[PDB]
């Protein structure tokens, strides 16, 4: 069940990134944007996952 749902998330992310085959960046973006999965795996690190695109508001100009 859990592999099926994370594979749904990964396939959705790959189709968002227009890729047929899933990559660890898709895995990172999928696992960080599901709050139950993210707080399930806050201390679990993915090889070559990268980070979420996240910029604080005061970092933006004006």
């Amino acid at each position: 069940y859990l592999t099926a749902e994370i594979l749904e998330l990964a396939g959705n992310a790959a189709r968002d990134n227009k890729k047929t085959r899933i990559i660890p960046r898709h895995l990172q973006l999928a696992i960080r944007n599901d709050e139950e999965l993210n707080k399930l795996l806050g201390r679990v690190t993915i090889a070559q996952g990268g980070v979420l695109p996240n910029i604080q508001a005061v970092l933006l100009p004006k």
Binding site: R25, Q28, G49, L52, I55, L59
Partner: protein
């Protein structure tokens, strides 16, 4: 005049780039050399799988990055945009080290 971007513009651009990117950010050979150097301090003549070195690089980069977002949270919490040594010291102590 020659072109010149204002400060922070290129910084935000590379922030977006490296958030977009997934690759390792430090050079492979000096990292492996440092790993061998510090592992020699505990026991002599240690041989390394390159996969082990890459795992160390990956875990180290992720650990450092997470510490850096904590530093960012401290800096914006301190009403500043420039990170400071006391921010990292605070973040380490709050995490419990």
């Amino acid at each position: 005049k020659p072109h010149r971007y204002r400060p922070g513009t290129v910084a935000l651009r590379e922030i977006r780039r490296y958030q977009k990117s997934t690759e390792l950010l430090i050079r492979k050979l000096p990292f492996q050399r440092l790993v061998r150097e510090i592992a020699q301090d505990f026991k002599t003549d240690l041989r390394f799988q390159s996969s082990a070195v890459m795992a160390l690089q990956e875990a180290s980069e992720a650990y450092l990055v997470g510490l850096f977002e904590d530093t960012n949270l401290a800096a914006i919490h301190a009403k500043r945009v420039t990170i400071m040594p006391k921010d990292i010291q605070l973040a380490r102590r709050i995490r419990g080290e």
